Ligand binder design. Structure first.
Ligand SMILES: O=C(O)CNC(=O)[C@@H](CS)Cc1ccccc1
Ligand SMILES: [Ca+2]
Ligand SMILES: [Ca+2]
Ligand SMILES: [Ca+2]
Ligand SMILES: [Ca+2]
Ligand SMILES: [Zn+2]
Length: 316
């Protein structure tokens, strides 16, 4: 759409009011011209055909219940772009300001969200296991992060390299939740999962075992489901990341925490410079050691906390 940039107001899935960047040309569109090549939000209209229609609204006000998921997918994708640009100096997912597109209201009672190789897609949930997926900042950044991986390391979605792919997305979606200061935590999906139950989440970075995921290499899933346990074995890498950051004793091994910022710096560098499509857990270890080395020196505490963390989860 070609038109005048303006700003509208709306209510998100959680009932919160926010301002969003729109474009005016007869109608008001969910098209934000201020970020790279633009952020575009689309209506999939309960169908599976993508992307659906560019979101059009008559008065620049987004307070209807059908509007809520479009408001949050549009705004959180702006926050995510901001995080990457400001913190890591990366312009959009390809590093060249590619336009970011999202479709909401995808299918009927679709309990997922994904990156299809070209855009982000959000189901509205069934109302019980989930509420519309874009209402969770960590879900939105997990997604966008898959775009980042795709253009960099290119981790294949299966087995060891696939679980690394999932871990990276949980790690960066968690960094983005803390960056926005939106009630942050080391849990994944908490804001949109099981609206009827309090206190839970889909996955836990602090204690993956809390929901049955492995928190040690020796407890890794060797089967075939979930592409070889991509969303299962990600817990081993999530635990490691949470240790480097915050510190702690796990299975007897003590790790001194180096905090979030350094954790984001080391992982981004492993991602962008050292990891390959076929990298395994052991290779992720050498990549993270080497990034921390590059940035803080071979004899830094930074390097020593990364080794401790991997030894704690049995990776190497
Ligand atoms: O597909 C699965 O098994 C679970 N899906 C996920 O973990 C991702 C899709 S890769 C979508 C999502 C991320 C974070 C939070 C909620 C939903
Ligand atoms: Ca309106
Ligand atoms: Ca939170
Ligand atoms: Ca969270
Ligand atoms: Ca819940
Ligand atoms: Zn994922």
């Amino acid at each position: 759409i070609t038109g005048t940039s303006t700003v509208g107001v709306g209510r998100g899935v959680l009932g919160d009011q926010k301002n969003i960047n729109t474009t005016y040309s007869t109608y008001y569109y969910l098209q934000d011209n201020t970020r790279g090549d633009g952020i575009f939000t689309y209506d999939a209209k309960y169908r599976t055909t993508l992307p659906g229609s560019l979101w059009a609204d008559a008065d620049n006000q987004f307070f209807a219940s059908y509007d809520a998921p479009a408001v949050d997918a549009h705004y959180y994708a702006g926050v995510t772009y901001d995080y990457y640009k400001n913190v890591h100096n990366r312009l959009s997912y390809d590093g060249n300001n590619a336009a970011i597109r999202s479709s909401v209201h995808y299918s009927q009672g679709y309990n997922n969200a994904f990156w299809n190789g070209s855009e982000m897609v959000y189901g509205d949930g069934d109302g019980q296991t989930f509420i519309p997926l874009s209402g969770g900042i960590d879900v939105v950044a997990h997604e966008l992060t898959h775009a980042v991986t795709d253009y960099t390391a290119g981790l294949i979605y299966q087995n060891e390299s696939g679980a690394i792919n999932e871990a990276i997305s949980d790690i960066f979606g968690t960094l983005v939740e803390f960056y926005a200061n939106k009630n942050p935590d080391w849990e994944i999906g908490e804001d949109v999962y099981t609206p009827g139950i309090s206190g839970d989440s889909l996955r836990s970075m602090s204690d993956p075992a809390k929901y049955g995921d492995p928190d040690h290499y020796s407890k890794r899933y060797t089967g075939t489901q979930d592409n070889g346990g991509v969303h299962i074995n990600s817990g081993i890498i999530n635990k490691a990341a949470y240790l480097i950051s915050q510190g702690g004793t796990h299975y007897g091994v003590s790790v001194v925490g180096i905090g979030r910022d350094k954790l984001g710096k080391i992982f981004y560098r492993a991602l962008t410079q050292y990891l390959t499509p076929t990298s395994n857990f052991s290779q992720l270890r050498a990549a993270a050691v080497q990034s921390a080395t590059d940035l803080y020196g071979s004899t830094s505490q930074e390097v020593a906390s990364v080794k401790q963390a991997f030894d704690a989860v049995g990776v190497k």
